[PDB]
Design a protein around this ligand. Structure first.
Ligand code: HEM
Length: 376
């Protein structure tokens, strides 16, 4: 990511455009190939046969790291329980969890990430999974100790992370063996009870699917909520129209997703040689598919750096493409919408404070880790 991520991105944007225009396929000093254009990133993401996801071979048994046909048979059991109707019924819970957050903010000057956008995705997974409310602080604890994986070295960090994972995996496991004996109406209970053509996730694939949702739908949603407030702040005409018409909160989320996509890249391993934009990547190499440049590619999104609420061309690969397309996009959108509805609903006045107090993650997640605001 060959500039500094800490000026909002303006510098990365500029660097991508050139990389797009003049090196749409680039072998980095580590042997890693990068692809920057929309058509090419999309191409890689959907062709699971050429570009494999078993990046281990140069959650190892789970859906982010296996491929079809096996990938298709496991994810169809998850989606058995992760139904779109169950995600929609989630809406009143999300609204309540966002009102509680807002009700408890520490006065009119606070950190909009720490005290709202950072906790809400975690509380929501935890209420979806069936975690009793009084256990829900333990989850916040674990996502704090585990966020190194969402972001992505030293042995120290690795060891502490592995032990946070054991802790959580024993809590979950025990918490699934109970849903087998005392079924409840949580997501957990649907997993344990899914069955497709006479097959069942075993108890461990449930645990691992649980930890996966936690860690996948957490920080991505946090930056989505942060980032969309950053877009409104950098475009006062847009924040005008959204406030005077919250009907536009969905449109604003889409454009935020394009302009400031939470997930920067996606990595596959090449299963054969292949020519991409007149460059040829050898087999058994590692490829880095820049979801962010694609979403900023002029060839398809005119004025990529402009925040337009009424773009003619839609179709951003913020959530990806192919068989691995984000299993939570539906849920993620909903979280963002409700939470923005509430936040802007509750404060006519939300200003950065200071505007130079924002800091950003440095990693695969693109957005603010700190967002001090002042409200009224
Ligand atoms: C703003 C919100 C989100 C964004 C931008 C986002 C982005 C993405 C992207 C780009 C991928 C594709 C990875 C790849 O193809 O290599 C992905 C996969 C995935 N996401 Fe999301 N995600 C979001 C929220 C969520 C949520 C809320 C959940 C669940 C609660 C979730 C669960 C997953 C899972 C399980 C996968 C892997 C699917 C598979 O490997 O077949 N994500 N996400």
């Amino acid at each position: 990511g060959q500039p500094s991520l800490t000026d909002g991105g303006a510098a990365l944007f500029a660097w991508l455009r050139t990389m797009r225009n003049e090196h749409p396929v680039w072998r980095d000093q580590f042997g890693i190939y990068h692809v920057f254009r929309y058509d090419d990133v999309r191409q890689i993401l959907g062709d699971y046969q050429t570009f494999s996801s078993d990046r281990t071979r140069l959650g190892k048994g789970g859906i982010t790291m296996i491929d079809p046909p096996e990938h298709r048979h496991q994810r169809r059991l998850i989606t058995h329980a992760f139904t779109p109707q169950s995600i929609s019924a989630m809406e009143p819970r999300i609204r309540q969890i966002a009102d509680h957050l807002l009700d408890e903010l520490p006065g009119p000057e606070f950190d909009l990430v720490e005290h709202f956008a950072y906790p809400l995705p975690v509380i929501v997974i935890a209420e979806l999974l069936g975690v009793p409310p009084g256990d829900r602080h333990l989850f916040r604890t674990w996502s704090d100790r585990l966020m190194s994986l969402q972001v992505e070295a030293d042995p120290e960090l690795a060891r502490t992370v592995a032990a946070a994972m054991t802790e959580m995996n024993d809590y979950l496991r025990e918490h699934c063996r109970s849903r087998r004996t005392h079924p409840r109406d949580d997501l957990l209970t649907r997993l344990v009870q899914a069955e497709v053509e006479g097959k069942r996730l075993d108890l461990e694939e449930v645990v691992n699917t649980a930890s996966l949702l936690l860690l996948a739908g957490h920080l991505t949603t946090t930056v989505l909520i942060g980032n969309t407030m950053l877009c409104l702040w950098d475009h006062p005409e847009a924040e005008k129209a959204v406030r005077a018409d919250p009907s536009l909160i969905p449109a604003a989320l889409e454009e935020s997703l394009r302009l400031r996509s939470p997930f920067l890249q996606a990595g596959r391993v090449t299963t054969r040689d292949v020519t991409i934009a007149g460059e040829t990547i050898p087999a058994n190499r590692f490829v880095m598919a820049w979801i962010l440049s694609a979403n900023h590619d002029d060839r398809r999104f005119p004025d990529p750096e402009r925040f337009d609420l009424h773009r003619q061309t839609t179709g951003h690969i913020a959530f990806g493409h192919g068989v691995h397309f984000c299993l939570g996009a539906q849920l993620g959108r909903l979280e963002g919408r409700i939470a923005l509805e509430r936040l802007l609903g509750r404060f006519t006045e939300i200003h950065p404070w200071p505007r130079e107090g924002i800091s950003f993650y440095q990693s695969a997640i693109f957005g603010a880790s700190r967002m001090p605001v002042r409200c009224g």
